[PDB]
Symmetry: C2
Amino acid sequence: MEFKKVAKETAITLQSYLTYQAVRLISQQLSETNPGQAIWLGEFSKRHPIQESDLYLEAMMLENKELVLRILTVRENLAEGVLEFLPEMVLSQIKQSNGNHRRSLLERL
Amino acid sequence: MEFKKVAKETAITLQSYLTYQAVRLISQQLSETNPGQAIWLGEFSKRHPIQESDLYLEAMMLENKELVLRILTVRENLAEGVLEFLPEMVLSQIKQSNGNHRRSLLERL
């Protein structure tokens, strides 16, 4: 098994996913504080796929510089906050799901 | 902890993404040992989106129980090795990305 090469791919995916989580947390905050801006943010995201997170951030710089700053900031905090718990949490989630599917497959016999 | 909801949502996402990576690897092994099953698998993945990994596995066990059991095992083994590299890779990539976006933002009026 090619653990490191798959890790590199997974890292690229996770970079975009954590940008998505940052945008999500900021939207939830704006929904209490400035709903018009949360709405604007929601519309921007349907025009620009967060999957292409570098392109997403560059596009936003043309329309809302302050929000880009906020996303980069939150995404950085999130990463630092979350990343070290991930190995255990992901492996645990997979073990649980494996148990679940095995029991369903046994019921399927 | 902190970011519990985020960390959890991220874990479930990576669980699906690592299932994708498991199926991809298995598909490659099957192309050598049982090309007809490699083809069945490709067709199966076209019709069932791997992003919905639990539904994918639940559908497959109706048709091919052995392959489900193999995916469960591979995705766990893969996760063990992949998650060891992930934190530092993802942090350093976010760092590089920030650097690029920072320059982009600072260099314009």
